[PDB]
A and B are shown apart, each in its own frame.
Chain A
Amino acid sequence: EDFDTRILEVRNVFTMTAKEGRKKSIRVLVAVGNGKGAAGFSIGKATDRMDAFRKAKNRAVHHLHYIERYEDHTIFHDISLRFKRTHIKMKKQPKGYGLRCHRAIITICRLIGIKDMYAKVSGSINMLSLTQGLFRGLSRQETHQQLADKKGLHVVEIREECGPLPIVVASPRGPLRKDPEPEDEVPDVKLDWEDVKTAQGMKRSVWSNLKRAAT
């Protein structure tokens, strides 16, 4: 009863059979979630639409990923993934930013319990691939505690609204590492051209940052 069920795609699929000519069936992609991290998705094939809904939504709850949410409202870090031919770029956002994401991603994030995140989908926008890649990336994300345990250093949050106050959001479980870590002069990180263009203001898309209803 704590889980909510949402439809993501309803496709009519036909097959060529000698006995019946063109056989018709319904394939339904269903996402379920309890709004507290536990969410899943499933595919239901049936001759009847309601039967497909029932099959998919009853099968989804047996395939529940648990998505870790930072402060119970957002992802822990930016996630860049390419599932098949679908690129998903998720940006961690502060409280109150809302869900500026693909409508399917908006629905899935509502099911998970994410309230603030950005998400851009590029390449193929196939709904099944989009959902699978989104769940893969969200499940594979690394929490602050895991990072602190892995590198044995305090994970400290710096907030502009809080000034120079250092907020220790994570601390290693085991002994702390006294290595002051490498002060990398230049980070060898693969940037995304769209993000740099937006930061430098060269991007002038008439569709970005459009006023939209609350999400």
Chain B
Amino acid sequence: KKPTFMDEEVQSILTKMTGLNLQKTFKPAIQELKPPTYKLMTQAQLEEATRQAVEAAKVRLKMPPVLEERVPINDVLAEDKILEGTETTKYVFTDISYSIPHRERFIVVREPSGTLRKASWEERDRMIQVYFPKEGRKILTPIIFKEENLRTMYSQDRHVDVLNLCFAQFEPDSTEYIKVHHKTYEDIDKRGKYDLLRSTRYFGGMVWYFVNNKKIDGLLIDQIQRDLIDDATNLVQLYHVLHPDGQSAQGAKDQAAEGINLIKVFAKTEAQKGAYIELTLQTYQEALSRHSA
């Protein structure tokens, strides 16, 4: 079976690729500030506090699950033709029972034509927000998600902010969430701004999107330039794992491609910019020979 995003090996690979830049993960936030508190710590106490901060950062960077687009809801519970034309406005009945999970709530729509149907996904999310208000979400779709504003946010290099807004507003399996995430990933790949998403929980999603679209050339180039050779090798190995039938994976299987030779094989096979990938890898090898020795 082809591995899924939430598989343990893939999760570990993406966690290693993401990085754990502790300053970036806990960058100071522009909010209502309170006077800080100071503790006197020994070296062991400071190390323990740093380790606890690392654990908290790992909890914070838990990658959101990538889900396939939800199938549109099209179900008619009843067709009461007697009610046709009685009312000129739909009725949206929402089961607001507290203990029911939000994806098991029965939200129904009584149409003016007398049709009692199940609520669409958009209506479901709207009513869930109306009657169970989640912080950070709006009933009406914010105008920030329009493309004219998305391009401005990308120009301001606020891709992480865009993804945070998308996660807050839309559900992970919604059409809008997937579309916005893909647009952000495309812009990041085009402008080569991958380092923006490093040490953030969206890096795994970006890597998975690139691998599933077989355009990991730019990320590999950035990792080689940023001397993340182990991460680049992990990315190539994950690409081969998710494309066992791929020619690059077959070539890696045939030879004993264990380290940098994996990246060489990927550059020579199944890379759109393989020549430039090989050139950058050669430049890294030259720098390593120059300075390591």
Contact surface of A with B, Cβ cutoff 8 Å: 91-97, 144, 147-148, 151, 153-166, 168-169, 176-181
Pair B42/A161 contact, Cβ less than 8 Å: no
Give A147's nearest chain B residue, CB to CB: B40
Within 8 A of A (CB), among B26-79: 26-31, 33-46, 49-50, 52-53, 56, 60
Pair A160/B34 contact, Cβ less than 8 Å: yes
Pair B52/A97 contact, Cβ less than 8 Å: no
| Closest chain A CB from B196 CB (angstroms) | 20
30 A-B interface contacts by CB (under 8 A): A92-B35, A94-B33, A144-B38, A147-B40, A154-B41, A154-B42, A154-B46, A155-B38, A155-B39, A156-B38, A156-B40, A156-B41, A157-B36, A158-B36, A158-B37, A159-B36, A161-B30, A161-B33, A162-B26, A162-B27, A163-B56, A164-B49, A164-B53, A165-B23, A165-B53, A166-B50, A166-B53, A169-B38, A178-B42, A178-B44
Chain A residues positioned under 8 Å from B53 (CB to CB): 163-166
| Closest chain A CB from B164 CB (angstroms) | 16
Chain B residues positioned under 8 Å from A158 (CB to CB): 36-39
Chain B residues positioned under 8 Å from A151 (CB to CB): 40
Report the separation of the CA atoms of residues A117 and B238 in the bound assembly, to the nearest whole angstrom.
54
Give A178's nearest chain B residue, CB to CB: B42
Q: Does B279 contact A (CB under 8 A)?
A: no
With A97-B33, A156-B46, A156-B49 given, is the CB distance from A161 to B28 under 8 Å?
Answer: yes
Dominant SS among interface residues on chain B: mixed
- Which has the most chain B C-beta neighbours within 10 Å: A95, A144, A168? A168
Q: Does B22 contact A (CB under 8 A)?
A: yes
| Closest chain A CB from B289 CB (angstroms) | 37
| Closest chain B CB from A119 CB (angstroms) | 14
Pair B38/A181 contact, Cβ less than 8 Å: no
With A151-B40, A176-B43, A177-B42 given, is the CB distance from A93 to B35 under 8 Å?
Answer: yes
Number of interface residues of B (CB under 8 A): 28
Chain A residues positioned under 8 Å from B26 (CB to CB): 162-165
| Closest chain B CB from A168 CB (angstroms) | 7
Chain B residues positioned under 8 Å from A91 (CB to CB): 35
Report the separation of the CA atoms of residues A23 and B41 in the bound assembly, to the nearest whole angstrom.
63
Pair A161/B29 contact, Cβ less than 8 Å: yes
- Which has the most chain B C-beta neighbours within 10 Å: A93, A154, A158? A154
Pair B35/A165 contact, Cβ less than 8 Å: no
- Which has the most chain A C-beta neighbours within 10 Å: B38, B43, B53? B38
Report the separation of the CA atoms of residues A39 and B53 in the bound assembly, to the nearest whole angstrom.
40
Pair B49/A166 contact, Cβ less than 8 Å: yes
Report the separation of the CA atoms of residues A178 and B41 in the bound assembly, to the nearest whole angstrom.
9
Report the separation of the CA atoms of residues A169 and B46 in the bound assembly, to the nearest whole angstrom.
12
Chain B residues positioned under 8 Å from A94 (CB to CB): 33-36
Chain B residues positioned under 8 Å from A154 (CB to CB): 40-43, 45-46
| Closest chain A CB from B223 CB (angstroms) | 26
Chain A residues positioned under 8 Å from B36 (CB to CB): 94, 157-160
Chain B residues positioned under 8 Å from A164 (CB to CB): 26, 49, 52-53, 56
| Closest chain B CB from A74 CB (angstroms) | 9
Chain B residues positioned under 8 Å from A169 (CB to CB): 38
Enumerate the 4 nearest inter-chain pairs by beta-carbon distance, A residue then B residue, closest first: A94-B33, A165-B26, A153-B40, A166-B49
Chain A residues positioned under 8 Å from B31 (CB to CB): 161
Give B39's nearest chain A residue, CB to CB: A156
Pair B46/A168 contact, Cβ less than 8 Å: yes
| Closest chain B CB from A155 CB (angstroms) | 6
Q: List 11 other contacts, CB 8 Å, given A155-B40, A162-B28, A164-B53.
A: A94-B35, A148-B40, A154-B40, A162-B29, A163-B56, A163-B60, A169-B38, A178-B44, A179-B42, A180-B42, A180-B44
